[PDB]
Design an enzyme around this catalytic site. Sequence first.
Site, PDB file in Angstrom:
ATOM      1  CD  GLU A  50      -8.517   8.548  -4.160  1.00 52.65           C
ATOM      2  OE1 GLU A  50      -9.604   8.146  -3.618  1.00 52.65           O
ATOM      3  OE2 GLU A  50      -7.319   8.300  -3.673  1.00 52.65           O
ATOM      4  CE1 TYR A  72      -2.264   3.788  -1.122  1.00 51.42           C
ATOM      5  CE2 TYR A  72      -3.598   5.030  -2.807  1.00 51.42           C
ATOM      6  CZ  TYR A  72      -2.970   5.008  -1.487  1.00 51.42           C
ATOM      7  OH  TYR A  72      -3.333   6.080  -0.757  1.00 51.42           O
ATOM      8  CG  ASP A 120     -10.159   5.215   4.008  1.00 52.36           C
ATOM      9  OD1 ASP A 120     -10.807   4.489   4.899  1.00 52.36           O
ATOM     10  OD2 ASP A 120      -8.667   5.221   4.106  1.00 52.36           O
ATOM     11  CD  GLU A 137      -4.451   9.367  -1.221  1.00 52.72           C
ATOM     12  OE1 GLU A 137      -4.690   8.131  -1.511  1.00 52.72           O
ATOM     13  OE2 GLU A 137      -5.229  10.300  -1.081  1.00 52.72           O
TER      14      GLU A 137
HETATM   15  C1  LIG Z   1      -6.942   4.126  -4.044  1.00 49.95           C
HETATM   16  C2  LIG Z   1      -7.524   5.171  -3.171  1.00 49.95           C
HETATM   17  C3  LIG Z   1      -6.987   4.857  -1.954  1.00 49.95           C
HETATM   18  C4  LIG Z   1      -7.421   6.110  -0.794  1.00 49.95           C
HETATM   19  N1  LIG Z   1      -7.137   7.338  -1.513  1.00 49.95           N
HETATM   20  C5  LIG Z   1      -8.000   8.481  -0.631  1.00 49.95           C
HETATM   21  C6  LIG Z   1      -7.489   8.361   0.939  1.00 49.95           C
HETATM   22  O1  LIG Z   1      -8.178   9.332   1.588  1.00 49.95           O
HETATM   23  C7  LIG Z   1      -7.524   7.165   1.455  1.00 49.95           C
HETATM   24  O2  LIG Z   1      -7.193   6.912   2.803  1.00 49.95           O
HETATM   25  C8  LIG Z   1      -6.852   5.923   0.535  1.00 49.95           C
HETATM   26  C9  LIG Z   1      -6.781   4.687   1.172  1.00 49.95           C
HETATM   27  O3  LIG Z   1      -7.552   3.899   0.967  1.00 49.95           O
HETATM   28  O4  LIG Z   1      -5.762   4.486   2.065  1.00 49.95           O
END
Ligand SMILES: CCC[C@@H]1NC[C@@H](O)[C@H](O)[C@H]1C(=O)O
Lengths: 580, 580
Positions: free
Chosen positions: A401, A457, A166, A495
């Site tokens: 991840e 999240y 992302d 995160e």
């Molecule tokens: C549920 C995984 C979330 C994800 N995790 C990795 C980040 O590099 C992304 O930006 C973040 C997002 O989707 O905001």
Amino acid sequence: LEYSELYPIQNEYRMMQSLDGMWKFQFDPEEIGKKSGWENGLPAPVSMPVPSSFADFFTDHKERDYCGDFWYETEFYLPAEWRNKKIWLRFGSITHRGTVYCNGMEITSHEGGFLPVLADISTVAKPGQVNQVVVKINNELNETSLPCGATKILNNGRKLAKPYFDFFNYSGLQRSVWVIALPEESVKDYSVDYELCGTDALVKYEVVTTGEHPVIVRLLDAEGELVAETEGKEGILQVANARLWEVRNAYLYQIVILITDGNGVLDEYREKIGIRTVRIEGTKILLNDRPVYLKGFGKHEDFPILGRGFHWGIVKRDFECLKWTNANCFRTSHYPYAEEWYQFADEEGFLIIDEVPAVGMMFFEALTVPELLKSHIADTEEMITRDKNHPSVIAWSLFNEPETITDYAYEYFKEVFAAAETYDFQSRPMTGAFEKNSKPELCKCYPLCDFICLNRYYGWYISGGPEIEEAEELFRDEMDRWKAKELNVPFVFTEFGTDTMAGLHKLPSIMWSEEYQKEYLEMNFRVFDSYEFVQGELAWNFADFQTTEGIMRVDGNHKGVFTRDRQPKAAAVVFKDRWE
Amino acid sequence: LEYSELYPIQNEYRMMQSLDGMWKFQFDPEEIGKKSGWENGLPAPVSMPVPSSFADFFTDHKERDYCGDFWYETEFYLPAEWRNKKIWLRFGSITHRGTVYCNGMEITSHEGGFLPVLADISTVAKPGQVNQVVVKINNELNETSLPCGATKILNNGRKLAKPYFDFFNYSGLQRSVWVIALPEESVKDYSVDYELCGTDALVKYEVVTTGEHPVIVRLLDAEGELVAETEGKEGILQVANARLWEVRNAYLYQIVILITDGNGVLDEYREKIGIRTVRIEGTKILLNDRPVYLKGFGKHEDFPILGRGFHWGIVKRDFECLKWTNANCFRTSHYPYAEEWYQFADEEGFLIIDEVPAVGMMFFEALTVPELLKSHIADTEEMITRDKNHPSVIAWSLFNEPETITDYAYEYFKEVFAAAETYDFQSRPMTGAFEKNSKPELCKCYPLCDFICLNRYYGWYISGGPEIEEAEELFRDEMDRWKAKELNVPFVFTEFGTDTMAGLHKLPSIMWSEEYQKEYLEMNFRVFDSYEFVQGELAWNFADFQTTEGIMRVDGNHKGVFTRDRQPKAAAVVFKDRWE
Ligand SMILES: CCC[C@@H]1NC[C@@H](O)[C@H](O)[C@H]1C(=O)O
Ligand SMILES: CCC[C@@H]1NC[C@@H](O)[C@H](O)[C@H]1C(=O)O
């Protein structure tokens, strides 16, 4: 490594010249550059700033979205005095992969877009003359190099990057470039490790040189006074009444490494280091034998127009903002940053979790996985060798991840962690960031970690908005499961966040509003604070940043606590007040 | 001048080393630095990026708004080979005024914040050693230097800048800094002037050196091949079948200036130049004897966080945006820009009106005016000497919106225009931008100009919004008066625009909406196109930019056609379509 990762310096023995500025640049959609003599000069170039990402300068989609081979060129005058030294081109990075040419000669190739590339031009350099450097770069994504993704072919063979991650596929020469001259026998590497002994400290060291001549190592304090001196490539510097490097209260000594022969000096390397220990004890993270709770953010190298291009001004603003929030830590999500970030963290007393670009791995049953593993380990070796002597770096993140619930994944990561352990002279904590799919009952990889990093999240991707009270219950349910495992390790949230459009206000709050970002954080804090083993919180993200276009991204990712031009949303004060 | 304005280059005779990076920095509100020996090192510094403006890094108002004395420091290793060279510190600028120290010794002082500062450190430099540079800088505004303003003292002694101009008082070391080494006898200055003779051209030149040895001048074409060679400090290069530098279609020759003695070359200076002529004939602006209509913008050196800090990335994006609008010209409102802007304009075939920082002069009966005049003329000398050999620079702008209706103003500007003429070997057109207060019946200064530049805001400051039909009639009333004067000179509109908040939409349009910006421009174009003697239109402004805070400025000036992060508002397409 067949080269040094040491940051370049200038003194009697070592020279350096910056190659930053406007380079020549040319896209190569037909992949005909090496077939057409481009390594001797580009036929129809335009100007391109270095350091910078190339993408956001242009006004046409096909230029911004360019994927494939593209080329850089510049010329530089080499002083005659550099003759017969070991002359190297040093690139802060080449994103993602490339081949370096000098004076028409292939010098080296490198895979991995976020770590230094060293090219030995000793035999082709022309002292007292104009020299030429040409770089073939490629920014495609695949499953055998980091970060992972795919490459799509559109109409007319036009390539498009399809990340498994992302963030926008910025590329090019995004960091500073130097040409440097080293003595024929030089300091190639060194490592320091610390022990605290009451009011005194020990600096254990190892030095690697390219010769057999004697080594002297000195330690100077912040005023340049000699506090310790030892002989030999391996030794201990004893520091009386040591001034420790402390969180948000840095103190830096200068290590001075000398190679001598008889009467004279052959080489001298100097670098600032900080005396500090980091240890995991049960569920606590200890810095200089005192518990520390991590407070901060995942960041990105991301800024308007420059992309991931390095600029000290971005460092300065970001650190002033970090300090204003009362943060003490950030993670280099999701790749090693320019070396300058760590230099500054060292000065400001910030803690860093240094992360290899192992993102987009979710997969480990493919026949390409052995090649991927080799790449992953290579990047890990380069990162650790480059960053190990920064006092700010207190942990290594070896993934973000991935799939972790199969035995395929376990054997893979066992090799990565084993390799990382051999590279870090300090053996400091190693970890990685786990996605929700890595359920407590299923994940096989958390035992490899010195502490566990969770990306969660609850309240955004899971049970957001009107379901936020269900989100809290689901969150506590998972944390209760982790608690019941009694792993006796620290947990750090690496995160958590909500996309938040600056200026979107609503009462009652809605997902994407500034008010919802506040309420989401408040809920998450209540959950964090309910578990003793939680030892850190790094919010996603410090600032809004660029992603691939899509129906889920409104001009990039808006989970920033700050806007992309580095101004605080309402939620920034929530962090400031909590972390004070 | 007691120094060279020539851009630094590296070759066998000339060396350069960049001092850009993180410097040490300290505010000096009590004005104690010099009596405390800060020229030997700052006692409690913080880190500051160079190049950049310091203001927008900080998170506290008093730091952002700091006005008074402040200090910079850095260190650099000087190669031992540089001994017996003339060694100079070269600052792109020091904003606004400062004193340069090196190794504890006062070297030079300079007043004027937008042109190079050269400091000869030959006698104090230590080759083969670490050297130190410290700069004391002041950013106060007054009425005896450019740009003009006042300095308010709050009751606690805190100073606040009070500009007489509409841009934020950014300051510091905003441009690149080098240390350079020149040969003991060097090329100090040169001037070229062009004449077109059928298919051929003549390049008339003068060279100023720091010695008496013979000079050879060569001209190379864009592929490096010799097309002309002459000897002597004054001469004429004859160029057969010359490839002229054309609007948006540049061609650049390279001039090569050699000093020689009986044993060979002593110095070599090389610079790209473009063969072109600029002339005013009646109401036409002629480039290479063909009329050109100017299409473009007033700009600023302004970008998020960096302030006026130089970055090639800003240059690249801005020129891509300019080309996308089909522009051919910009004015360096309201101060000379970093040299790199002109270098790039030369490559891209853009026309530049180069402007001295004579803004905020409305006044000419004060006892301070003779000193202001000297400052104004000094800045003019430095600008013209620095920029005269750029093919892009087609005109000098010697003021922006001063008082012009008194005899005091006429005598003042008579001296400025006279001085400017003596400095410009090419004797190119000279002008200045007039506000509305300079009524055609009252202004005494437009006859000094070779063409007239008007700043007008019919439809914004005059009869905006529901009165825009009245604004158009008033605009035509004034232009009919100019027409009846039958001056037979070109008129160029150098400012016109509306504050426009990205995303503010209204039907029907309102002042501040994107739609009104479009309608305002359409109205202005109808008026421009009604008068034959109009020969150019430079909109205010290319991009939203920072001003002092106030009830009339919503985070700066929003008359940009682009946002501050360089994205087009609706009106940008209106320019694109018209200028195509
Ligand atoms: C549920 C995984 C979330 C994800 N995790 C990795 C980040 O590099 C992304 O930006 C973040 C997002 O989707 O905001
Ligand atoms: C009526 C004078 C208008 C004024 N002129 C000078 C520019 O530097 C300002 O920015 C511009 C403005 O107020 O927008």
